[PDB]
Structure 1
Amino acid sequence: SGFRKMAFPSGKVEGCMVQVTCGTTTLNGLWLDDVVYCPRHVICTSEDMFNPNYEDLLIRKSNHNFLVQAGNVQLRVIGHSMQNCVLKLKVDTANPKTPKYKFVRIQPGQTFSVLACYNGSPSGVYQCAMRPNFTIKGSFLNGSCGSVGFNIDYDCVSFCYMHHMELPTGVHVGTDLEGNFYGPFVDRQTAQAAGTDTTITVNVLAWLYAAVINGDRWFLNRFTTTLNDFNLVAMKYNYEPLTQDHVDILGPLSAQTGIAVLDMCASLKELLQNGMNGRTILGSALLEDEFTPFDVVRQCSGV
């Protein structure tokens, strides 16, 4: 037993990270087949980033201006293109370590693993949720752009995130692997607002189920509620409204504990209105919402 925030094993992605340098700017790229993907602001000087015209900037760059390095081994760039906010650098060698992979655009409330890299070398791996306001609470320093987020299903890597920027609030924003930003953000170093964030209700419920599956029961009570009655409370606490789809997704957990979903909603309601009284759930004194229902099943059954 036990429950932890767990990242996917990163080996399949580690073999795809390379370094991309353009003039004095260096960040990471993702090498799949004969293409290297990287954020387009690699072509900016630290001064261009406050208001770049990426078209005019790219027009002064040729293939030999993109230095791509896999380990200590250099790659030869034979073409380049700009797709939305990423660059696609064509190289003359297919990555012999390319895994089976897909590009997917993840939905808010889903989770994924981030392999934080610098100079094309992995630094560490951690799990993130795509917030409802399309931000993530990451750990990113200068040079970390091009670090990617991913899920793994058996042997297939679904790439869903490439890192680009940190907002003034300390949260992090990026694109899918076709260069489209998650959320209302642009890759210009100017003040940008993510808007009100809300708690992922279905994930909090899954984590309360995970808590019961691991022996923390003090918050179960003799009450029940309705979808409509609970959502009047979710409103007051900037929680996502719960839906019947959410209820269905909690089915497997509702069946392994024997606790009806609306009964667990009744516990959550009391925790929202009364706090935790200095008690703790799975070693946390806050309500955690970065575990999907899928995440709890996977960990509580050894996938």
Structure 2
Amino acid sequence: GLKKMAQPSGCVERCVVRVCYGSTVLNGVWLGDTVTCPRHVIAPSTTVLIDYDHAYSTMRLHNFSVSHNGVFLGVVGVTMHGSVLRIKVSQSNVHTPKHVFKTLKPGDSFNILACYEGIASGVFGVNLRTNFTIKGSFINGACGSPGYNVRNDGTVEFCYLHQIELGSGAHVGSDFTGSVYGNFDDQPSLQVESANLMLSDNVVAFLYAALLNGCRWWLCSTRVNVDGFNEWAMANGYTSVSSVECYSILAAKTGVSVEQLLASIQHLHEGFGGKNILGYSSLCDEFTLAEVVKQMYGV
């Protein structure tokens, strides 16, 4: 069985704060004596293009209010870095977890802690898609909601801060250095993301999960090698497959080769008509190899 799960949120919850500037409110992340939040918090109320360099030069520290669970923190200084602010506050978060900052790549899975007014309301796993957007569930006020991963040694990787929802409904964020994923503008615009490609590495993982569950009506005995599949993938809305050897644990157990699964993808590309694979009516790219392995075997 396959269930999308999030990693536990407790150590990240203790870092979420409410950041207010004037009347504008969003979420920030408090590590040590620094709060990171989207710079949208200092935007003037207007319908014209936002000049953030001008808003930054006219910023006054006393217009900020930063709080953790209703306890207000004193603001010492603020610098702007791409699409985020770094707010120095006058005391350190005594529950700062061991952490690093990591910039995601397309195909990476991570966890979103969806937050409103400095308070977490939900947690879910997501994948950064090839168009550098995610499909989240955010209502008004989710700006600044953090994305994270928890390494095996317990280190939190801070990798995402929610920035904006595009007209299409797709969600855009930045890393903690202020670079927006996909170079989208961090203010209202008419921007549209590129077409989403199916994540081939995840699809291969999904088909191995199907095999391990005894679902194999779809298996091809044809073989397509990596170079051939990657050329087909270009023309058919799929990514290249990154490598084959990482699947060897699943390959030995099944015992089906990655190249057989690549041929199976080409066979199943259009539809299942109208059978299903693990309940899905079309190929699923939601689950990574690491998830299939960890959910099947704890590794």
TM-score bracket for the superposition, by shorter chain length: over 0.9
TM (norm. structure 1) is 0.94
Corresponding residue number in structure 2 for 1:177: 176
1:121-270 correspondence runs (5 A): 121-154=119-152, 155-243=154-242, 246-270=243-267
Counterpart among 283, 288, 292 of residue 292 in structure 1: 288
Matched, 1:120 2:118: yes
Q: CA–CA distance in 2 between the matches of 1:46 and 1:200?
A: 39
SS of corresponding position for 2:150: strand
Per the alignment, residue 12 of structure 1 pairs with 11
1:4-36 CA-to-partner distances (Å, cap 9, x unmatched) read 011111111111101001111100000011100
Determine the structure 2 residue equivalent to 1:23: 22
What do residues 39-68 of structure 1 show as CA deviations (whole Å, max 9, x unaligned)? 0010113426x5111121122222221100
- C-alpha distance in 2 between matches for 1:229 and 1:59: 54
Normalising by structure 2, we get a TM-score of 0.95
User: Cα RMSD over matched residues?
Assistant: 1.5
The count of aligned residue pairs is 298
Amino acid at match of 1:39: P
Cα contact 2:150–2:156 (8 A) shared by 1: yes
1:40 and 1:86 in contact (8 A); partners too:
yes
Provide the rounded CA distance (Å) in 2 between the counterparts of 1:65 and 1:128: 35
Contact 2:44 2:50 in 1 (8 A): no
> Of 103, 106, 115, which residue of structure 2 is paired with 1:105?
103
Residue 32 of structure 1 corresponds to 31
CA distance, structure 1, for counterparts of residue 90 and residue 178 of structure 2:
23
**Cα displacement string for residues 235-279 of structure 1 (whole angstroms, at most 9, x for unaligned residues):** 332111224xx2122223223322111011122221114x11122
More divergent stretch after superposition (165-174 vs 217-226): 217-226
Task: Answer yes or no: is the 8 Å Cα contact 1:198–1:238 preserved in 2.
Answer: yes
- Deviation, 1:186, is 1.3
Report the Cα offset of residue 197 of structure 1: 1.9
Does structure 1 retain, via aligned residues, the 8 Å contact 2:172–2:181? Answer: yes
Matched to 1:248, the amino acid is E
Amino acid of the structure 2 residue aligned with 1:200: L
1 CA distance for matches of 2:286 and 2:108? 8
User: Which secondary structure state, in structure 2, belongs to the residue aligned with residue 300 of structure 1?
Assistant: helix
Deviates more, 1:66-75 or 1:229-238: 229-238
**Structure 2: gaps spanning 5 or more residues:** none
* Aligned-pair CA distance for 1:301: 1.8
Identity %: 45
Amino acid at match of 1:84: G
C-alpha distance in 2, partners of 1:83/1:52? Answer: 16
* Maintained 8 Å contact 1:85/1:175: yes
